[PDB]
Amino acid sequence: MQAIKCVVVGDGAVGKTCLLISYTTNAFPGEYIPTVFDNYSANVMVDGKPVNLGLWDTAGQEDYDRLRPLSYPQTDVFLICFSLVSPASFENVRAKWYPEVRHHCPNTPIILVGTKLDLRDDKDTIEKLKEKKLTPITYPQGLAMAKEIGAVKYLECSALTQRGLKTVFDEAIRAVL
Amino acid sequence: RKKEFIMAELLQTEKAYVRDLHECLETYLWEMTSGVEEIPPGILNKEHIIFGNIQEIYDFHNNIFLKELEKYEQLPEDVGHCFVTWADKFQMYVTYCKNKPDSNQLILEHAGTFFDEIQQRHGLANSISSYLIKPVQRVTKYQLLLKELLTCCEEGKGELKDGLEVMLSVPKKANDAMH
């Protein structure tokens, strides 16, 4: 049976841990957002054919340029994430994430994931952004970033509403079969 | 409530880490040092390169650190002191990270399916590679937990600040030690 290592990278502001927890438990954790997601594997069926999917978090390692790539070798697929309501995180895809992922794993597929889709239509968030002379990241922006880096897909999701979440990981698998 | 959620995670995740290192030592490391199974010549007596000082990291967490975090269960606001007390022991993450690339290449180039066979045999969800990244994960994760405590503890909280400073410095030193 096919085993799949999937590493999830991006800024603290994406909610990496939350995303993974929300995907795996089928529910936004709500009460308390845990800071720890331990390496996970589980059997799922994709286009019929069952698959063992492996998920590694990278949260905590965002300031450790030489430690993060320890997780990189033998990865079957990367999720490079940015938060849709953080322009900085989006720009970091280009400035930080894609470069180190390519430098170490030149032929490994990347899915570009915009997280926090539920906050893109949120007054308080939008206003918090307007105050810094910024706006949320829109769909054509993600598509164009995806092209620029060689992502096989650009996908949007919310851990909160679960919208696009299952699809993200389905597509992570489809990019390896 | 938030401070107690975090301490509860700190402790639950510490137990899991100790359980995971233990598993690693008693499956992957044991098979090699046993001489019950036939061992690839590419990796023979290179267990020091594969597992680095993970025995020592396990012993630390299993004999000392988990016992001591437990004592702070009702003292979340003070738990930074735990790290201060035991700062020198965390220097062993520096040695571990240094060795990790060497460990990783070694496994690709010379073990073929040795560890895959053992994984399969024992019925483990975690590969040897999954177990061996954990100390790197864990050493960067402590600082997250302390930041969380800082968001919800009063000015009786330089009993976090100094803990955090230690747990920021360890991973940085480990990071800056890499070739």
Ligand SMILES: Cc1cc(NC(=O)NCCS(=O)(=O)c2ccccc2)no1
């Ligand atoms: C990843 C990821 C996260 C997400 N959405 C997200 O975080 N939305 C804001 C949640 S909140 O801050 O309003 C909140 C409310 C109640 C308890 C805790 C937090 N979508 O993708």
